[PDB]
Design an enzyme around this catalytic site. Structure first.
Site, PDB file in Angstrom:
ATOM      1  N   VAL A  19      -1.246  -4.637   1.959  1.00 19.06           N
ATOM      2  CA  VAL A  19      -2.043  -5.856   2.124  1.00 19.06           C
ATOM      3  C   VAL A  19      -1.479  -6.690   3.290  1.00 19.06           C
ATOM      4  CG1 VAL A  19      -2.858  -7.957   0.944  1.00 19.06           C
ATOM      5  CG2 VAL A  19      -2.606  -5.796  -0.317  1.00 19.06           C
ATOM      6  N   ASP A  20      -2.231  -6.701   4.395  1.00 20.42           N
ATOM      7  CA  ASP A  20      -1.725  -7.226   5.685  1.00 20.42           C
ATOM      8  C   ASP A  20      -2.699  -8.260   6.275  1.00 20.42           C
ATOM      9  OD1 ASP A  20      -0.581  -7.672   8.056  1.00 20.42           O
ATOM     10  OD2 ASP A  20      -0.617  -5.625   8.807  1.00 20.42           O
ATOM     11  N   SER A  21      -2.452  -9.538   5.960  1.00 18.78           N
ATOM     12  CA  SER A  21      -3.331 -10.608   6.450  1.00 18.78           C
ATOM     13  C   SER A  21      -3.313 -10.741   7.977  1.00 18.78           C
ATOM     14  CB  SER A  21      -3.021 -11.949   5.777  1.00 18.78           C
ATOM     15  OG  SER A  21      -1.759 -12.466   6.204  1.00 18.78           O
TER      16      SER A  21
END
EC number: 3.4.23.-
Lengths: 124, 121
Positions: A19-21
């Site tokens: 999960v990589d904003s």
């Protein structure tokens, strides 16, 4: 500092997604697309070369299953991306997600579904 | 088909900057240029040098009216002023809430809006 991953499934096949904003695009590896048996969804019109790396094509609105919910998501397929799945800001926005580090969960805003971030020992 | 990033306003030592919110980054990093502008070069511990110039062990990052105790390394030639990474997001129990379009500081309840495209550095 433990990085953020969640469990999910695509076409019934389990995977762990990063999960990589800070990533603009959601990307699945070609190996993971083969394992999930979804090469029929890979539109080679959208082939190119990513920053850094062949993008093999793009999947339009396939379902990513998180807990019991099925979320329609588009994503590109990168040859030799080590990790199976990178969930970027495109997806996180689409589904109005919250990355909640107090509760240690990803909330899917459109449904209210919540999934725990993986503990250190379960990261790939 | 294919082939706005998350920023917040904050201040360090009273100087404004815009921080890139990156949950995929392990480390929070300020550019040397920003460290100089914020006048905090005296806080840089250069024994942590690599290029990373050194580490700031303790500094206050101001978000809205909150002052948050943070640690971050200093990178020469990083394009953006600050990259806010998972170390500091986890430390302050933050939520990146894309329904409300806010970063929530979990320890205080303070919220700040993500910047629209026209306000990106």
């Amino acid at each position: 500092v433990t990085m953020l991953y969640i469990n999910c499934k695509v076409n019934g096949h389990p995977l762990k997604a990063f999960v990589d904003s800070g990533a603009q695009m959601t990307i699945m590896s070609q190996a993971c697309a083969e394992r999930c048996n979804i090469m029929r969804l890979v539109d080679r019109r959208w082939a190119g070369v990513a920053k850094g790396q062949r993008i093999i094509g793009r999947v339009h609105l396939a379902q990513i299953q998180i807990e019991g919910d099925f979320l329609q998501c588009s994503f590109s397929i990168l040859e030799d991306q080590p990790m199976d799945m990178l969930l970027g800001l495109d997806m996180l926005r689409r589904h109005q997600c919250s990355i909640d580090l107090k509760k240690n969960v990803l909330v899917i805003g459109t449904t209210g579904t919540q999934t725990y971030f993986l503990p250190e020992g379960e990261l790939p």
